[PDB]
Design a protein around this ligand. Structure first.
Ligand SMILES: Cc1cc2nc3c(=O)[nH]c(=O)nc-3n(C[C@H](O)[C@H](O)[C@H](O)COP(=O)(O)O)c2cc1C
Ligand code: SF4
Ligand code: SF4
Ligand code: SF4
Ligand code: SF4
Ligand code: SF4
Ligand code: FES
Ligand code: FES
Ligand SMILES: [Zn+2]
Lengths: 106, 103, 256, 186, 89, 425, 106, 117
């Protein structure tokens, strides 16, 4: 329902039981494990070669070879610590499905 | 934008209709301030009646949230009124997230 | 009195007022390098370049006054194109000292790069280095770290009295030093280390002792010499080491 | 070096003009009567003409005569390119290497002068007869080869004509405003 | 250099007539070999031709950001921020 | 509609015989008493009605700029200063107007004295041209002793005294604000142009900026009819501007010509190297150094006038030809132009001290061919930025010609980079 | 890797800056690899709680081989600051993609 | 690339590689690393106080990554066992300088670090 980082494109299988007993609540987790390799295999096949961090040095720190030569990179590397990111104000709530439940970070 | 923007707003217009729908009821008992930014909705509620607001969003035909899963509270001394209880709500049939606050 | 709009919102200002001086009343601070508090208004950087509502070329905030009721935007697309560009010119011939540099967080040029400067990349090949200038007891001056501006040049002639610092060359080889080997007099020239935005002039007693981080500031009146009051003293765990002049309206004119 | 100043054997010993002191007072009268620091720009050129190789002590003595700041007057001659700082001989010749002169060969005239007068292009001659220094535009661009020495600038000189004029300059003065062609129209 | 007590490393006094230090008695106190910057001046100064030369520890592999040092003062030694390496001419 | 070259009409042409007495017989101060007797309002209107264009490298109206001061009421007395030195290379403005005929320039300051309202006149000549500056001082000494200008001379109540001062020879005579700062006594650096021009405050007085070729034209416009100068040229550009041709040519010569003249006919008068636009590759600039190089294809349609030249790439500021041959390298020639601006830059605005020096260091790699093919387009982005965010227009002078490499050319620069990459790398 | 994922995305929604396309595919590859740890503990310790001794040691040999993928991708054994608001901190080494495919096959 | 017990590196021709910034102090989530600096005799200005407490430290590799000069480089250490807390926490360099016995492995490990993996 709610994609995070490239979802719906990867084929997911969700195990859902019939009764709310401990045995069916155990079987779904084992069926999650048998239907987990499908996601891993599709992640192995679909890999675009490119960038690891964001190009913005305001958010993500630059490369080690990059900072040693150019000026702007090292200053942004220096300022991403002490007083780092500089976040835009406003309350936000995100939840990504944990294998146990949800991480409702606010 | 390739790496600059996270996501384009398309459902934001449909989510803005929710901010009008509850406001169309228009209670000074409930509504006050409606804020909506970044694919989400935030409502703050007058202290006198919180239970009638919680019965709403639950059960209702147009908006069937029901699950009031996460419950937070803010600690801030800037305002004349100190703490702020913040409810985080989720729908399973409707598939949407809404926020309830106290002042 | 004449009213002129700044970022659509109108604000009242005097007939003879600077663009950067008028923007502060509307609660907006432009990127600065040449002061507006007490030091004389001068160009020699063009960082504060802001575009008007109808203008073919961008004008500096220090030089150009408001005069007529004209709209000026601070968060405009034209203003962002300048600020992201001028930073690249400032750092094209910058010696790179940030870890070793005496300032780190206190540096004004360091902060402006994070907020206004272009983060993505920096294209440069071969930066020119200047020879070390002679200094006595206070403020061990490094000429390489200096951005070659007009702040300390005017401070020696007006605020301090006896002139010492000035222009030495023409191109990139131009230095802000005294040119002739002579030690600077005391009087009030100790505030010049606190005056400079970059890590060019910094006190020899407080050199490589404590950074801007970790040191906690506390306001206290000066004991030595009368009239002088309000000065921030950094704690920095147990024993104090860094002393800085705190801003006062009438007590002290931005100098300890 | 442009910012650095020497301290050994050229920092305290210098002489000011005494015969041209009456002419120096008249130069201040040409500008405004009150707030006159304009004469400092003119007196720096006049001191360089009378005494070769301007010293740091000589600049300090000139600032006391006009009554101005010592730091400001020393910096004023540093920005200008016309006044010599280090040392120059009897007649110092400067060659133009700029693009309007470079289009009709300026490097060919510069290479011929470097070999005939000997030594490097930057360093001056040990005999102290001709000092070599690379310069920008002089003024008159109408003649394709251009070189300025002492006071009079020679215009239009060939690869062999420049070396012959340089060797002749050692004993007798040789002004050559237009060896190549008429000055007005060629 | 050592006087009565344990040897000083990177300028650190032990104790004045033994009052504060007492714990470092049963266990032997640590000491760093060549910590008085004796190896700093042991390396020979390199000759240069240009007016300014860029410094490096060992290329991009070893940790050294690029710093330009001016060698025109003659009387001054001319050393980078990270290294104690001196440059002449 | 088409303009003919000169045809026995010139403002200043005498170079064979002129000193003081010889110049006076050949059109000099003919209606000196007539101009002095006339009112300041009518004398200022005489230049405004004719529509005189700025001879100096700016592109500003000479009638509008002279009337911009006006002086209704002033506490401190006003003084007008004229620049004699030549800033941009490939200009004979100092070699002809100051050296050959000093009588025309000396009369020009007196002509624009009573009209502008100036107590004293000042001249700033080039430092390298000491012999040329000495001729101007000799003509001024002959005029003051006899009784031509000063105190009560020429039948006028208003006094005007001429004085010549030697300059540094760089950016000091460059900008309009720079001339005031150099004459004041301070270091050679231009003042802040946005809030106050020369008219508001310059060296403790209201002032006006004047060129050597512009100030000499003022007595020629006053003595002769206003329609005589207005007829020659175009609809917007009027008068006659002296153009100097030097470089790849059979015989280089500086000659006065009428405005809105074609490039094919102007080069034919001096005769270019081999062929103008047939065999030899054209890379000639319409200006001295301020204007970028013009292509071989677009040259016949382009005119010498300021209004017509602005449509094609950029307008000529100095208005002078600098011809280049096919044998001569294009990349090597323009690299020297930026190298000139590296030394002439004053040292104030940060995108010029560490901007032009940054540009020249990259441009040195283009001659060798070690630069990447991607670096060409990135160079265009930085060069455009200097044009907008500078106090004086010398930063523009190191911005316009660099844009002339990206425009018109590009395969010529790419061929030098590709050859060194295959041979050395 | 299921943790920090919720935290970094919240910073990514605050700053409104998308992670690079390569980093997004690594996040799912390591998001599914956490499910191999969590659902194993949801069986192994759960069976150990009841009284089953075998299944706990049946999968912990697999789990100790699983932490090798964590160790090779980031210097720590268990908890690593590998997932960051700038997408992903460090690149996948050459000796991992051959190992993931070999591990999933068995 | 593996993190264990902390050890600071040095240049091939003597000299301390650490420059004293208080950078790694600010990145440290536990605040286990403490740094106070004074000028070293004449010229060079590198460290006086340098304590890394093992009472704290969650082992991030943050200080290994934040360091511009690459002073703290994390080695493959395992053996650390003490009688008291005093023996556990590292003193003013010294024991951290005694990482020379692990610096031979560090030089081999950092060859996989430059131009990352
Ligand atoms: C780089 C540069 C150099 C210049 N050099 C001179 C010069 O040497 N002499 C001059 O008269 N004008 C020069 N100018 C033109 C000035 O702008 C001049 O003061 C004035 O604006 C020209 O207008 P006018 O002819 O009406 O006086 C230069 C302009 C630039 C951009
Ligand atoms: S002057 Fe500022 S930006 Fe430059 S190295 Fe020093 S602290 Fe960093
Ligand atoms: S030392 Fe500082 S205040 Fe002085 S010119 Fe340099 S940057 Fe400006
Ligand atoms: S643009 Fe260059 S030459 Fe002109 S005032 Fe600015 S720094 Fe000086
Ligand atoms: S370990 Fe690195 S970051 Fe920390 S103080 Fe030393 S040099 Fe600076
Ligand atoms: S690994 Fe982390 S906790 Fe340990 S010293 Fe480094 S930054 Fe601090
Ligand atoms: S900050 Fe306005 S000109 Fe420098
Ligand atoms: S360009 Fe050579 S004399 Fe002007
Ligand atoms: Zn070094």
């Amino acid at each position: 329902t709610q994609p995070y980082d490239v979802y719906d494109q990867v084929e997911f299988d969700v195990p859902i039981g019939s009764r709310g007993d401990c045995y069916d609540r155990y079987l779904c987790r084992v069926e999650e494990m048998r239907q987990s390799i499908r996601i891993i295999s599709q992640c192995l096949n679909k890999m675009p070669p490119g960038e690891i961090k964001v190009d913005d040095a305001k958010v993500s720190p630059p490369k080690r070879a990059e900072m040693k030569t150019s000026m702007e990179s090292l200053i942004h590397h220096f300022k991403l610590y002490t007083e780092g990111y500089q976040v835009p104000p406003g309350a936000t709530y995100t939840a990504i499905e944990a294998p146990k439940g949800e991480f409702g970070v606010y | 934008r390739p790496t600059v923007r996270p996501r384009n707003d398309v459902a934001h217009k449909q989510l803005s209709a929710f901010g009008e729908y509850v406001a169309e009821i228009l209670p000074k008992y409930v509504q006050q301030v409606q804020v909506s930014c970044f694919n989400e909705l935030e409502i703050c509620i007058h202290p006198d009646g919180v239970i009638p607001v919680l019965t709403f969003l639950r059960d209702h035909s147009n908006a069937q949230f029901k699950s009031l899963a996460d419950l937070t509270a803010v600690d801030i001394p800037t305002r004349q009124n100190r703490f702020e209880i913040v409810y985080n709500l989720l729908s399973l049939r409707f598939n949407s997230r809404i926020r309830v606050k106290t002042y | 009195l004449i009213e002129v709009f700044v970022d659509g919102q109108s604000v009242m200002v005097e007939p003879g007022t600077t663009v950067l001086q008028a923007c502060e009343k509307v609660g907006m601070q432009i990127p600065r390098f040449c002061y507006h508090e007490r030091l004389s208004v001068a160009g020699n950087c063009r960082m504060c370049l802001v575009e008007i509502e109808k203008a073919p070329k961008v004008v500096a905030a220090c030089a150009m006054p408001v005069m007529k009721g004209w709209n000026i935007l601070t968060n405009s697309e034209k203003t962002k194109k300048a600020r992201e560009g001028v930073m690249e010119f400032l750092l094209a011939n910058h010696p790179l000292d940030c870890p070793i540099c005496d300032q780190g967080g206190e540096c004004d040029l360091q902060d402006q790069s994070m907020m206004f400067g272009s983060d993505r990349s920096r294209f440069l090949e071969g930066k020119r280095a200047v020879e070390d200038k002679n200094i006595g007891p206070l403020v061990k001056t490094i000429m390489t770290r200096c951005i070659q501006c007009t702040r300390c040049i005017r401070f020696a002639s007006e605020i301090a009295g006896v002139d010492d610092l000035g222009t030495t060359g023409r191109g990139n080889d131009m230095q802000v030093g005294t040119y002739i080997e002579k030690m600077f007099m005391s009087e009030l020239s100790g505030n010049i280390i606190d005056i400079c935005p970059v890590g060019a002039l910094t006190x020899x007693x407080x050199x490589x002792x404590x950074x801007x981080x970790x040191x906690x500031x506390x306001x206290x009146x000066x004991x030595x010499x009368x009239x002088x009051x309000x000065x921030x003293x950094x704690x920095x765990x147990x024993x104090x080491x860094x002393x800085x002049x705190x801003x006062x309206x009438x007590x002290x004119x931005x100098x300890x | 070096v442009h910012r650095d100043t020497p301290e050994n054997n050229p920092e305290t010993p210098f002489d000011f003009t005494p015969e041209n002191y009456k002419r120096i007072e008249a130069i201040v009268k040409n500008y405004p009567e009150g707030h006159k620091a304009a004469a400092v720009l003119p007196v720096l050129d006049l001191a360089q003409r009378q005494n070769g190789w301007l010293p740091i002590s000589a600049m300090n003595k000139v600032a006391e005569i006009l009554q101005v700041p010592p730091m400001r007057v020393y910096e004023v001659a540093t920005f200008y390119t016309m006044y010599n700082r280090k040392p120059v001989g009897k007649y110092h010749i400067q060659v133009c290497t700029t693009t309007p002169c470079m289009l009709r060969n300026s490097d060919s005239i510069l290479e011929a002068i470097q070999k005939k007068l000997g030594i490097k292009v930057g360093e001056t001659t040990p005999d102290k007869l001709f000092t070599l220094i690379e310069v920008e535009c002089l003024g008159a661009c109408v003649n394709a080869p251009m070189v300025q020495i002492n006071d009079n600038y020679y215009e239009d000189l060939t690869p062999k004509d420049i070396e012959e004029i340089i060797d002749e300059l050692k004993a007798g003065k040789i002004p050559k405003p237009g060896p190549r062609s008429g000055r007005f129209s060629c | 250099x050592x006087x009565x007590x344990x040897x000083x490393x990177x300028x650190x006094x032990x104790x004045x007539x033994x009052x504060x230090x007492x714990x470092x008695x049963x266990x032997x106190x640590x000491x760093x070999x060549x910590x008085x910057x004796x190896x700093x001046x042991x390396x020979x100064x390199x000759x240069x031709x240009x007016x300014x030369x860029x410094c490096d520890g060992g290329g991009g592999a070893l940790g050294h950001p690029r710093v330009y040092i001016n060698l025109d003062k003659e009387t001054k030694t001319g050393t980078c921020g990270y290294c104690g390496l001196q440059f002449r001419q | 509609s088409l303009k003919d070259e000169d045809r026995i009409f010139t403002n200043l042409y005498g170079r064979h015989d002129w000193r003081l007495k010889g110049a006076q017989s050949r059109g000099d101060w003919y209606k000196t008493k007539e101009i002095l007797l006339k009112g300041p309002d009518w004398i200022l209107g005489e230049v405004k009605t004719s529509g005189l264009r700025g001879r100096g490298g700016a592109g500003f109206p000479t009638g509008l700029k002279w009337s911009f001061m006006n002086k209704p009421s002033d506490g401190r007395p006003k003084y007008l200063v004229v620049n004699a030195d030549e800033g941009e290379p490939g200009t004979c403005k100092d070699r002809e107007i100051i050296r050959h005929d000093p009588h025309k320039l000396v009369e020009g300051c007196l002509v624009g004295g009573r009209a502008m309202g100036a107590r004293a006149a000042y001249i700033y000549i080039r430092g390298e041209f000491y012999n040329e500056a000495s001729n101007l001082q000799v003509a001024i000494r002959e005029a003051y002793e006899a009784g031509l200008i000063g105190k009560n001379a020429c039948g006028s109540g208003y006094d005007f005294d001429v004085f010549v001062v030697r300059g540094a020879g760089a950016y000091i005579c460059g900008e309009e604000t720079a001339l005031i700062e150099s004459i004041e006594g301070k270091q050679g650096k231009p003042r802040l142009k946005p809030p106050f021009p020369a008219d508001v405050g310059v060296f403790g007085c209201p002032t006006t900026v004047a060129n050597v070729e512009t100030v000499a034209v003022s007595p020629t416009i006053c003595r002769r009819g206003g329609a005589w100068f207005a007829s020659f040229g175009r609809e917007r550009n009027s008068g006659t501007k002296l153009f100097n041709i030097s470089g790849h040519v059979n015989n280089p010569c500086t000659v006065e010509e009428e405005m809105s003249v074609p490039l094919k006919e102007l080069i034919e008068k001096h005769a270019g190297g081999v062929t103008g636009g047939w065999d030899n590759l054209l890379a000639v600039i319409p200006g001295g150094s301020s204007t970028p190089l013009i292509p071989k294809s677009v040259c016949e349609t382009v005119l010498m006038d300021f209004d017509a030249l602005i449509q094609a790439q950029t307008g000529l500021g100095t208005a002078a030809v600098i011809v280049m041959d096919r044998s001569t390298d294009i990349v090597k020639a323009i690299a020297r132009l930026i190298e000139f601006y590296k030394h002439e830059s004053c040292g104030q605005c940060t995108p010029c001290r560490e901007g032009v020096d940054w540009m020249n260091k990259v441009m040195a790699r283009f001659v060798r061919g070690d630069a990447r093919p991607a670096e060409i387009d990135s160079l265009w982005e930085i060069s455009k930025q200097i044009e907008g965010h500078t106090i004086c227009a010398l930063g523009d002078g190191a911005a316009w010609p660099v844009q002339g490499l990206i425009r018109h050319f590009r395969p010529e620069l790419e061929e030098r980079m590709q050859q060194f990459a295959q041979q050395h790398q | 890797m299921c943790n920090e994922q919720a935290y970094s995305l919240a910073v990514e929604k605050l700053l409104n800056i998308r992670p690079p396309p390569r980093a997004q595919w690594i996040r799912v590859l390591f998001g599914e690899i956490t499910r191999l740890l969590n659902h194993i503990m949801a069986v192994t310790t759960h069976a150990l709680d009841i009284g089953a001794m075998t299944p706990f040691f049946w999968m912990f040999e697999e789990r100790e081989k699983m932490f090798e993928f964590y160790e090779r991708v980031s210097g720590a054994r268990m908890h690593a600051a590998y997932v960051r608001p700038g997408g992903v901190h460090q690149d996948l080494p050459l000796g991992l993609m051959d190992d993931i495919y070999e591990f999933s096959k068995n | 690339r593996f993190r264990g017990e902390h050890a600071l590196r040095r240049y091939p021709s003597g000299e301390e590689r650490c420059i004293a910034c208080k950078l790694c102090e600010a990145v440290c989530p536990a605040q286990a690393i403490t740094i106070e600096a004074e000028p070293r005799a004449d010229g060079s200005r590198r460290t006086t106080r340098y304590d890394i407490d093992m009472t704290k430290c969650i082992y991030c590799g943050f200080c290994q990554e934040a360091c511009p000069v690459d002073a703290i480089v994390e080695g493959p250490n395992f053996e650390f066992s003490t009688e008291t807390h005093e023996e556990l926490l590292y003193n003013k360099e010294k024991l951290l300088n005694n990482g020379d016995k692990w610096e031979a492995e560090i030089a081999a490990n950092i060859q996989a670090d430059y131009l990352y993996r």
